[PDB]
Amino acid sequence: KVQIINKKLDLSNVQSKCGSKDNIKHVPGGGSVQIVYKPVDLSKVTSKCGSLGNIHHKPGGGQVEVKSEKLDFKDRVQSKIGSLDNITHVPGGGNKKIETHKLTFRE
Amino acid sequence: KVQIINKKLDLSNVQSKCGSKDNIKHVPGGGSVQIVYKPVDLSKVTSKCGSLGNIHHKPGGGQVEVKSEKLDFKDRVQSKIGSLDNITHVPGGGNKKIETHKLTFRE
Amino acid sequence: KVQIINKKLDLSNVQSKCGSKDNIKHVPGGGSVQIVYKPVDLSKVTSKCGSLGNIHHKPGGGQVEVKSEKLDFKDRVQSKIGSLDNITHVPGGGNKKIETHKLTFRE
């Protein structure tokens, strides 16, 4: 007769902050391959079939190919590196993250 | 007779802040391949079939190809690097993130 | 007659902060392959079949290939590195993360 229903996710599919904030680098001398296969997928397939049917749910995906028949380097491959990515990350303080979830029945 | 229904996501499919904020770099001497296959997909396929049908749900996807038949380098491949990406990240403080979710029944 | 139902996730599928914040690097002298196969998938397949049907749920996935028929290096492959990724990470204090979940029945 009284159905207080608080909730935050009922029938949900969440990818929060997902697959992010990543320094990818590549500093080669020569003839190098870097591959970062990094998808962020989310699917919800509901394929009901009826009585004689044929469902061919074939979405496919990424195909990354690198071929190289010939590649030469006739001289010295030198690479002097002093430094990379001199990151300084100084955040302040006093941060507050208050997440209050009250509820009240009375008479 | 009284159905207070608070909620935040009922039948949902969320990708929040998803797959972002990423420094990708590539500093080669020569003849290099960088591939960052980075999609952010979201799908919701509902393919009902009836009684004799044929559903061919074939959406396909990314095909990244790199071919190279010949490639030469007759002399020295030098690359002196002092520095890269001198990032300084200084945020302030006192930040407040208040997320209150009250509720009240009375008589 | 009174059904107070607090909840946070009922029938849910969450990937929070998932697969993130990663420094990938590659500093080769030459002829190197780095592959970081890093997807973040989430699926929810509900494939009911009826009475004679054929469901071929074949979504496929990533295919990363690297071929190299020939590759040469006629001279010295030198790579002097002083330093990489001089990261300094100094966050402040006083941080508060209050997550209160009250509830009250009365008469």
Take residue C13 and report the two structure tokens written for it. Answer: 């599928």
Distance of alpha carbon A61 from alpha carbon B60, whole angstroms: 6
Take residue C76 and report the two structure tokens written for it. Answer: 């010295």
DSSP B19: T
Nearest CA in chain A to C44: A44
Among B37, B49, B93, the residue with its CB nearest the CB of C92 is: B93
Q: Kindly give, in sequence order, each residue whose CB lies less than 8 Å from that of residue B32, ignoring residues fewer than 6 positions away.
A: A26, A28, A30, A31, A32, A33, A34, B26
Question: Could you tell me if B63 and A63 are in contact, meaning their C-beta atoms sit under 8 angstroms apart?
Answer: yes
Solved using: cryo-EM
- How far A60 CA lies from chain C's nearest CA (Å)? 5
Nearest to B24 by CA among A18, A25, A38: A25
Question: Could you tell me if A79 and A27 are in contact, meaning their C-beta atoms sit under 8 angstroms apart?
Answer: yes
Nearest to C20 by CA among A24, A17, B17: A17
Q: How far is CA C107 from the centre of its chain?
A: 49
Take residue A70 and report the two structure tokens written for it. Answer: 């010939």
Nearest CA in chain B to C17: B18
- How far A81 CA lies from chain B's nearest CA (Å)? 5
Among A8, A22, A34, the residue with its CB nearest the CB of C21 is: A22
Nearest CA in chain A to B4: A4
Take residue B5 and report the two structure tokens written for it. Answer: 């229904």
Distance of alpha carbon A43 from alpha carbon C42, whole angstroms: 6
Nearest to A19 by CA among B103, B16, C86, C82: B16
Q: What's the resolution in A?
A: 3.2
* Residue type, position B37, single letter: Y
Residue C16: what are its φ and ψ, rounded to 5°?
A: -90, 135
Distance of alpha carbon B45 from alpha carbon B47, whole angstroms: 6
DSSP C66: E
Structural element, H or E, at residue A63: strand A63-66
What is the DSSP code string of B40-94?
A: B----B-----TT-EE-------EEEE--S-----S-EE--B------EE-----
- Is residue C63 classed as helix, strand or coil in its secondary structure? strand
Distance of alpha carbon B53 from alpha carbon A56, whole angstroms: 11
Mark residue A17 as left, alpha or beta (left: phi above 0; alpha: psi -120 to 50; beta: remaining).
left
Distance of alpha carbon A35 from alpha carbon C65, whole angstroms: 10
Question: Could you tell me if A61 and B60 are in contact, meaning their C-beta atoms sit under 8 angstroms apart?
Answer: no
**Cβ contact (<8 Å) for A11 and C10?**
yes
**Number of residues that this document lists for chain A:** 107
Question: Could you tell me if A105 and C6 are in contact, meaning their C-beta atoms sit under 8 angstroms apart?
Answer: no
Take residue C42 and report the two structure tokens written for it. Answer: 């989430």
Nearest to B38 by CA among A58, A18, A2: A18
Distance of alpha carbon A20 from alpha carbon B17, whole angstroms: 8
Distance of alpha carbon A36 from alpha carbon B38, whole angstroms: 8
Take residue C50 and report the two structure tokens written for it. Answer: 């009826």
